[PDB]
Amino acid sequence: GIFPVACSDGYGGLVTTDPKTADPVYGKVFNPPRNQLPGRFTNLLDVAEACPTFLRFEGGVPYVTTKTDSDRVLAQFDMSLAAKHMSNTFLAGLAQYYTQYSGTINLHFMFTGPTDAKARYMVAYAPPGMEPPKTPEAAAHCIHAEWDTGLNSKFTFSIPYLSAADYTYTASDVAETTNVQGWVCLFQITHGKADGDALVVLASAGKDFELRLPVDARAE
Amino acid sequence: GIFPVACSDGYGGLVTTDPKTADPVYGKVFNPPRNQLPGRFTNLLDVAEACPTFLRFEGGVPYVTTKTDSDRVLAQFDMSLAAKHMSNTFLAGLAQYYTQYSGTINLHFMFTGPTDAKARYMVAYAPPGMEPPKTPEAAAHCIHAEWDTGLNSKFTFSIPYLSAADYTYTASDVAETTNVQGWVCLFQITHGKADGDALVVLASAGKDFELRLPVDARAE
Amino acid sequence: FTGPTDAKARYMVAYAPPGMEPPKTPEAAAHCIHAEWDTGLNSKFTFSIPYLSAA
Amino acid sequence: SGNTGSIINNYYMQQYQNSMDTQLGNDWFSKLASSAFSGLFGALLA
Amino acid sequence: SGNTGSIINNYYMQQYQNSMDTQLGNDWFSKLASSAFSGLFGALLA
Amino acid sequence: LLEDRILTTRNGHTTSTTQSSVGVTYGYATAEDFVSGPNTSGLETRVVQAERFFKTHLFDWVTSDSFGRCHLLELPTDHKGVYGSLTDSYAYMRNGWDVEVTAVGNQFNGGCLLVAMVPELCSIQKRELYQLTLFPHQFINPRTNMTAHITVPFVGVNRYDQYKVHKPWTLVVMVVAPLTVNTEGAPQIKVYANIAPTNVHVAGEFPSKE
Amino acid sequence: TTSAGESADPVTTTVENYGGETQIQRRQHTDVSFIMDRFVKVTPQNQINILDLMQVPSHTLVGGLLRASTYYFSDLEIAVKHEGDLTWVPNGAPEKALDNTTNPTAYHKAPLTRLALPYTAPHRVLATVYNGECRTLPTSFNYGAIKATRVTELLYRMKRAETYCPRPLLAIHPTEARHKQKIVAP
Amino acid sequence: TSFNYGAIKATRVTELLYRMKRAETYCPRPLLAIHPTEARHKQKIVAP
Amino acid sequence: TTSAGESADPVTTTVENYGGETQIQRRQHTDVSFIMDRFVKVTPQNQINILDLM
């Protein structure tokens, strides 16, 4: 007799994602050696942490310039990986292929003015549920950091993950009129003769930033 | 050569209940942590024992009120999980999804009259085969318990499983004119000034109550 | 409490510190240091008014 | 553990067949039902 | 090691299923990301 | 004639004492689950000053109310004290509830109330009231007692909540047997709640309106 | 036994109170895992179906019993009859993703496709009832979505199910003294 | 022209899908998202 | 932290700078092997197709 088997309905169709491999047809091929090639990367988030890329501000420029007028808001935008301000960063290019994330996103600010231009800046995270602050003073009640220019040109700040659920969506639903994850608010406290100087800003993934649930959604 | 196999007729179709699992297609997903959430339950009969729910008496009320007239029957109904009197209890809501049961069902009686209202009550189980008793005196020959009011407002009684077969049906067949499992008979022996006071009654599963043979039958 | 055995009540005592007008309702007064009690076998309830002052 | 009854081991890893649970840091109704009072409360006679 | 999840061993030899690698003689971005400075740089107060 | 079932609950600098106690029902758990998870990134804090009793009238139990008459109170409710201000200063919060409901008439009244703490109570149907005892509960029955006490932890699909859009718990009081007054009963019973937030944790500080 | 009925501590008396004997019970058919773990039919939309367990009718065994809990967790299996190929996309995907075949797409193989899917929501558990608007349930409460040229049958089966906080389970309300039915008989 | 994995031929080929096995990548290069026209790129996300 | 921004050495601050706590991350979905390993449709030529991933 031979071994009896039930060919089961509902199993066996090709799935574009399945965990199994095809049968081989052309054996024994040995490759050219490639051990030690420079520049390998294993995890897309190692490069998202190690390489910050630029934010995009009105005008299509990666910087904000100091204003000399009573308005102290340098920039205010949705803490969303689908924000226009984030749309040219590598982090946003990565995030479109996943549906959820959590963890820290770091912002970097670099002053580009001459040695006799000085300024003091403030970055605040405003959580959802109230309108974002319009002044340094209302914003002082948020988690925030303030710094000034000097020998070191750069300052880096971690935007905290704060949410009711443990993960958030990387895309923004057309129903969601208010940004679901809050705002980041960049202010100028004052400057001494920094008129017209640019503060350039970049973003990178923090230590516990995480993307999960791969998705392909047209997009490029 | 390769391994020969007999693809067997009569095996392999999808069964809505089968003991096997589908092939996976989207690996590696780690969930949000949920260890220690309050309120878990593992077995529907743990909640059927720990949470008694109310019986339904004529008028759509969960109680019976003391009568002041020569009729001492407070309530008499079929010991059936399909009885109208049981139809709003959780035990009956559970029992409709199984075809057989056995074991104890507990009835709880709670007096709600004021401190100067007193009464004495009797509950009896009348087994099938004779008409249910109409008086406390005829009913004294049944398994029965009698109690009165006082500092403790509640009394609980186990209806015994007694049957020729080891399991009974939770549904009632349209052919069965007399209830197959007997009656429970609640009587008022007397009262002192308890006119109009309500005795509320609940039911819960006993220690050895058991439901077996899951069935889905439209019903809600 | 001095009422008969079939009279029942529940009471609240609150200490309202200076600096705001004293509360006029149990609900506004719930935010103060306060205690609430009811009648029963023991007829008496005792409460300590706290000393609270700048000096 | 639900309604499953194969004696041999799954062909796929557990990490593909199910989501994996993580920890931070019949539980309640079982404890509740076990704690039920099953005594008497009077003095019993006979 | 990518997206593969069978517990049992392949029916075909490795030499047929894949090309074989040879040697002569997350590597860089992992080392790079691990070396990131995560400190402070001032004197901290409170 | 009267009773020694005597309890004092203290929550912060507020205490409440009854002499007709019956005990407290703990719902679903005896302690809160983890208050610190990944969704607040270690930025959450406890604010002990909000853990104290506040008070609200619920309804007046009168002889014309019959079986099924309900009063619901979604929690959190308006609070004009420090818990209430917490909800305008932080985007995320979690707390449990320590709940005391009082219905005082006297022992010559009859009838019965069921008080229950129900989660996610998007309203109830009539037949479901026969199974309200599935929720953490206690009865108030005038020949025995005047106070119901239930303690419940935070629950929800999320470890921290946004109370401005979601209410996890509803206190419900239901008449299970109608009030009787007879010749010595009180003529009606006003039902009041004395409630304390427990374990309150907040995260995500808001700007001011300045 | 008498007891204080106001209290809510469970009281379970036994037949031993009057001389009987409590028997042994075997309760594996009311185990939550076991009983939720079987397929149930839902009526499908023609093409896009979002996988939402609240679609199973409330009178069915699985719908009756899922609604008897307020929070739940499970993984999922689906069996689908469809024309064309079937694509599934996880929770949070843009609806347009349902047209890209690198998302898990199962090529048609008669007579139906049976798939094992993970829990994918961003929440630690989901709920059958949510008191935000008071009917509607947050849009993140789902297991993703599927699409094919036509889907004809869709069955859901809960795997590894957990339930928290029980809620009312109602039987038929009989009009007469007993709900009577024709029971299978020789 | 040497950058290829060979070639296939049949009387008609109707569908062709590729799947990379054991992939290694060296030297990262720009990965661009959609550029939104409004302040956020909004989409209809799968919802019950 | 401030640092010299001209340099290009990576700087990764954490929420600990203002009192938060960095959580654990599980990054298997951004592993290169894993993520490249799924089928993708190309539009074919009728007969000869050279296999070219571009």
Side-chain angles (χ1 to χ4, degrees), chain A, chain B, chain C, chain D, chain E, chain F, chain G residues 1-134 136-186, chain H, chain I:
Chain A
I2 62 188
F3 189 81
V5 119
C7 319
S8 306
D9 283 6
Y11 300 72
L14 164 99
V15 181
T16 47
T17 230
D18 68 0
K20 66 177 187 280
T21 53
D23 287 337
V25 303
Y26 192 77
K28 277 151 149 158
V29 343
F30 283 91
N31 294 320
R34 79 178 107 105
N35 63 297
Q36 255 153 253
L37 286 200
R40 171 95 192 267
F41 64 96
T42 273
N43 193 99
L44 277 332
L45 293 188
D46 287 337
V47 357
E49 291 185 26
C51 302
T53 52
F54 297 104
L55 266 69
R56 193 202 107 113
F57 294 97
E58 181 172 49
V61 283
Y63 53 77
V64 108
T65 51
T66 79
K67 51 236 324 289
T68 345
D69 84 285
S70 41
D71 176 51
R72 271 126 56 78
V73 181
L74 240 17
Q76 186 178 102
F77 63 81
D78 301 315
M79 180 24 67
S80 164
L81 265 346
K84 191 180 195 160
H85 297 73
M86 296 289 279
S87 61
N88 296 331
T89 60
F90 179 79
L91 197 57
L94 241 211
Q96 69 188 322
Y97 289 121
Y98 290 93
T99 76
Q100 288 167 208
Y101 77 93
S102 55
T104 314
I105 286 163
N106 287 337
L107 259 24
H108 300 272
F109 306 93
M110 174 173 70
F111 187 62
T112 262
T115 219
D116 63 323
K118 310 210 177 196
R120 170 166 272 273
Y121 299 105
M122 174 186 177
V123 59
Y125 174 57
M130 242 204 217
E131 257 149 88
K134 291 175 175 78
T135 61
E137 295 75 9
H141 301 297
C142 293
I143 288 162
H144 71 270
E146 193 185 288
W147 67 104
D148 57 17
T149 52
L151 195 244
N152 282 169
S153 52
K154 190 188 176 175
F155 177 77
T156 296
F157 182 79
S158 296
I159 304 308
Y161 176 75
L162 242 30
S163 198
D166 280 8
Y167 284 93
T168 335
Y169 290 160
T170 54
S172 204
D173 197 276
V174 93
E176 150 199 351
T177 45
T178 263
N179 197 242
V180 143
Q181 290 301 297
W183 303 268
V184 351
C185 301
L186 178 60
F187 299 89
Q188 187 186 269
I189 301 303
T190 18
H191 71 102
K193 228 212 187 182
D195 321 77
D197 291 328
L199 184 69
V200 348
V201 13
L202 317 268
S204 61
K207 227 103 200 56
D208 55 4
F209 182 77
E210 170 185 322
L211 250 7
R212 63 161 196 163
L213 259 35
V215 69
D216 189 347
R218 221 302 332 177
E220 195 224 317
Chain B
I2 62 188
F3 189 81
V5 119
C7 319
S8 306
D9 283 6
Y11 300 72
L14 164 99
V15 181
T16 47
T17 230
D18 68 0
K20 66 177 187 280
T21 53
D23 287 337
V25 303
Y26 192 77
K28 277 151 149 158
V29 343
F30 283 91
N31 294 320
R34 79 178 107 105
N35 63 297
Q36 255 153 253
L37 286 200
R40 171 95 192 267
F41 64 96
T42 273
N43 193 99
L44 277 332
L45 293 188
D46 287 337
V47 357
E49 291 185 26
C51 302
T53 52
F54 297 104
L55 266 69
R56 193 202 107 113
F57 294 97
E58 181 172 49
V61 283
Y63 53 77
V64 108
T65 51
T66 79
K67 51 236 324 289
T68 346
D69 84 285
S70 41
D71 176 51
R72 271 126 56 78
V73 181
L74 240 17
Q76 186 178 102
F77 63 81
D78 301 315
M79 180 24 67
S80 164
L81 265 346
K84 191 180 195 160
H85 297 73
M86 296 289 279
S87 61
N88 296 331
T89 60
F90 179 79
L91 197 57
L94 241 211
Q96 69 188 322
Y97 289 121
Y98 290 93
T99 76
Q100 288 167 208
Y101 77 93
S102 55
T104 314
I105 286 163
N106 287 337
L107 259 24
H108 300 272
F109 306 93
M110 174 173 70
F111 187 62
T112 262
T115 219
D116 63 323
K118 310 210 177 196
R120 170 166 272 273
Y121 299 105
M122 174 186 177
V123 59
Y125 174 57
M130 242 204 217
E131 257 149 88
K134 291 175 175 78
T135 61
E137 295 75 9
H141 301 297
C142 293
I143 288 162
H144 71 270
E146 193 185 288
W147 67 104
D148 57 17
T149 52
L151 195 244
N152 282 169
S153 52
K154 190 188 176 175
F155 177 77
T156 296
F157 182 79
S158 296
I159 304 308
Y161 176 75
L162 242 30
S163 198
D166 280 8
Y167 284 93
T168 335
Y169 290 160
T170 54
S172 204
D173 197 276
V174 93
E176 150 199 351
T177 45
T178 263
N179 197 242
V180 143
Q181 290 301 297
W183 303 268
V184 351
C185 301
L186 178 60
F187 299 89
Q188 187 186 269
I189 301 303
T190 18
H191 71 102
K193 228 212 187 182
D195 321 77
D197 291 328
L199 184 69
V200 348
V201 13
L202 317 268
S204 61
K207 227 103 200 56
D208 55 4
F209 182 77
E210 170 185 322
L211 250 7
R212 63 161 196 163
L213 259 35
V215 69
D216 189 347
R218 221 302 332 177
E220 195 224 317
Chain C
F1 187 62
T2 262
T5 219
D6 63 323
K8 310 210 177 196
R10 170 166 272 273
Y11 299 105
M12 174 186 177
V13 59
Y15 174 57
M20 242 204 217
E21 257 149 88
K24 291 176 175 78
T25 61
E27 295 75 9
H31 301 297
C32 293
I33 288 162
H34 71 270
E36 193 185 288
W37 67 104
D38 57 17
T39 52
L41 195 244
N42 282 169
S43 52
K44 190 188 176 175
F45 177 77
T46 296
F47 182 79
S48 296
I49 304 308
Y51 176 75
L52 242 30
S53 198
Chain D
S1 47
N3 176 207
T4 344
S6 331
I7 61 156
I8 81 117
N9 187 23
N10 205 288
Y11 179 88
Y12 296 99
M13 296 169 154
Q14 202 248 282
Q15 171 195 47
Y16 278 78
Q17 191 70 224
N18 286 97
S19 50
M20 309 299 303
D21 291 352
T22 62
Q23 305 310 298
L24 198 53
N26 125 43
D27 243 27
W28 184 254
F29 288 87
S30 199
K31 298 179 210 118
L32 198 63
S34 299
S35 81
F37 172 62
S38 297
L40 214 80
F41 192 154
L44 175 57
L45 184 85
Chain E
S1 47
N3 176 207
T4 344
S6 331
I7 61 156
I8 81 117
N9 187 23
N10 205 288
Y11 179 88
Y12 296 99
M13 296 169 154
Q14 202 248 282
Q15 171 195 47
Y16 278 78
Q17 191 70 224
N18 286 97
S19 50
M20 309 299 303
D21 291 352
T22 62
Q23 305 310 298
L24 198 53
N26 125 43
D27 243 27
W28 184 254
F29 288 87
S30 199
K31 298 179 210 118
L32 198 63
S34 299
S35 81
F37 172 62
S38 297
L40 214 80
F41 192 154
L44 175 57
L45 184 85
Chain F
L1 56 169
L2 306 149
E3 220 91 26
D4 157 359
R5 282 153 37 217
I6 288 163
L7 218 211
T8 296
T9 299
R10 141 120 186 285
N11 281 112
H13 301 325
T14 62
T15 62
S16 182
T17 299
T18 2
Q19 292 187 68
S20 60
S21 182
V22 159
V24 358
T25 293
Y26 287 90
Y28 299 144
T30 244
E32 209 134 298
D33 66 309
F34 309 92
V35 124
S36 288
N39 69 299
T40 53
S41 310
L43 262 1
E44 69 286 336
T45 49
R46 161 85 112 107
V47 2
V48 136
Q49 290 77 14
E51 301 182 359
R52 32 153 51 237
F53 279 118
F54 57 105
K55 300 173 186 313
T56 184
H57 172 62
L58 260 26
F59 73 109
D60 296 330
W61 182 20
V62 299
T63 56
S64 50
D65 300 315
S66 61
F67 164 66
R69 201 245 129 138
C70 273
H71 186 82
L72 278 45
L73 178 71
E74 306 189 322
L75 247 20
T77 189
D78 293 300
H79 181 297
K80 302 225 246 159
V82 347
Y83 179 83
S85 73
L86 250 31
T87 70
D88 283 322
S89 313
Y90 294 89
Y92 300 101
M93 295 179 59
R94 50 128 79 200
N95 58 273
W97 300 103
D98 190 26
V99 177
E100 186 190 74
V101 174
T102 251
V104 354
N106 65 198
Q107 69 278 244
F108 291 96
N109 281 116
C112 176
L113 298 176
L114 172 65
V115 352
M117 280 286 291
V118 182
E120 312 294 355
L121 181 63
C122 250
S123 75
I124 180 69
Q125 286 173 141
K126 179 39 188 285
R127 297 234 280 151
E128 301 181 321
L129 299 178
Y130 288 75
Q131 297 192 24
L132 201 74
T133 45
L134 293 176
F135 293 108
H137 65 271
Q138 218 173 48
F139 295 78
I140 296 174
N141 183 199
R143 53 185 297 102
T144 309
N145 68 129
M146 213 162 60
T147 314
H149 193 322
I150 299 170
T151 301
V152 111
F154 178 73
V155 293
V157 302
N158 292 147
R159 183 179 307 109
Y160 274 65
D161 212 334
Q162 291 170 102
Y163 291 142
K164 242 81 128 305
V165 295
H166 174 257
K167 252 60 177 187
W169 282 109
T170 303
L171 162 66
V172 356
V173 182
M174 184 193 76
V175 170
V176 345
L179 183 67
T180 60
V181 342
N182 313 286
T183 39
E184 303 298 308
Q188 52 166 197
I189 296 181
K190 304 182 133 275
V191 184
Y192 284 95
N194 192 26
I195 298 161
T198 60
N199 276 97
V200 358
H201 291 76
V202 297
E205 43 272 52
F206 279 144
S208 53
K209 285 85 162 169
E210 69 177 302
Chain G
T1 329
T2 64
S3 52
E6 296 85 2
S7 120
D9 295 329
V11 176
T12 297
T13 50
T14 65
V15 291
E16 276 75 359
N17 285 52
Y18 46 86
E21 179 167 333
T22 296
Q23 307 302 302
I24 73 115
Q25 14 52 69
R26 274 174 244 262
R27 294 185 173 176
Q28 26 289 106
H29 287 347
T30 52
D31 178 84
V32 174
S33 270
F34 179 79
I35 195 75
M36 304 305 278
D37 190 355
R38 53 243 316 129
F39 284 102
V40 57
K41 189 185 254 56
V42 125
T43 37
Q45 302 297 304
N46 288 81
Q47 299 197 311
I48 294 188
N49 279 72
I50 88 107
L51 300 185
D52 168 11
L53 257 26
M54 290 313 288
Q55 289 157 198
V56 349
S58 63
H59 54 279
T60 63
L61 181 163
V62 181
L65 250 31
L66 176 65
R67 294 178 172 74
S69 74
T70 135
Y71 304 107
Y72 66 92
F73 168 82
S74 72
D75 285 326
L76 191 67
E77 290 198 3
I78 53 175
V80 183
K81 281 189 173 164
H82 58 90
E83 276 173 11
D85 303 323
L86 175 74
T87 296
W88 165 85
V89 116
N91 176 303
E95 198 173 273
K96 254 175 190 189
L98 240 3
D99 296 314
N100 302 334
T101 264
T102 286
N103 301 116
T105 297
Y107 277 46
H108 184 88
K109 184 168 154 84
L112 49 90
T113 298
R114 209 235 257 219
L115 248 33
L117 297 167
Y119 176 88
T120 227
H123 303 295
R124 75 241 270 221
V125 106
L126 296 175
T128 55
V129 76
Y130 184 77
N131 186 26
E133 292 195 79
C134 169
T136 305
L137 221 40
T139 64
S140 42
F141 282 22
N142 64 67
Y143 286 73
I146 60 176
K147 187 180 176 177
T149 310
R150 196 158 83 217
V151 4
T152 279
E153 265 201 46
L154 167 60
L155 319 184
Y156 288 115
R157 137 111 87 159
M158 290 177 71
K159 300 304 291 179
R160 295 161 75 192
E162 305 178 350
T163 48
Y164 303 79
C165 310
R167 301 190 82 82
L169 222 196
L170 253 12
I172 292 300
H173 178 257
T175 181
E176 323 156 279
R178 264 189 277 133
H179 181 50
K180 284 194 285 315
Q181 284 162 104
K182 156 121 88 147
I183 286 173
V184 130
Chain H
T1 64
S2 42
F3 282 22
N4 64 67
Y5 286 73
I8 60 176
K9 187 180 176 177
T11 310
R12 196 158 83 217
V13 4
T14 279
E15 265 201 46
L16 167 60
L17 319 184
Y18 288 115
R19 137 111 87 159
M20 290 177 71
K21 300 304 291 179
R22 295 161 75 192
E24 305 178 350
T25 48
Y26 303 79
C27 310
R29 301 190 82 82
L31 222 196
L32 253 12
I34 292 300
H35 178 257
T37 181
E38 323 156 279
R40 264 189 277 133
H41 181 50
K42 284 194 285 315
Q43 284 162 104
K44 156 121 88 147
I45 286 173
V46 130
Chain I
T1 329
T2 64
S3 52
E6 296 85 2
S7 120
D9 295 329
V11 176
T12 297
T13 50
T14 65
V15 291
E16 276 75 359
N17 285 52
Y18 46 86
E21 179 167 333
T22 296
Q23 307 302 302
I24 73 115
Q25 14 52 69
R26 274 174 244 262
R27 294 185 173 176
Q28 26 289 106
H29 287 347
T30 52
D31 178 84
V32 174
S33 270
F34 179 79
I35 195 75
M36 304 305 278
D37 190 355
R38 53 243 316 129
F39 284 102
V40 57
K41 189 185 254 56
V42 125
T43 37
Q45 302 297 304
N46 288 81
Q47 299 197 311
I48 294 188
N49 279 72
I50 88 107
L51 300 185
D52 168 11
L53 257 26
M54 290 313 288

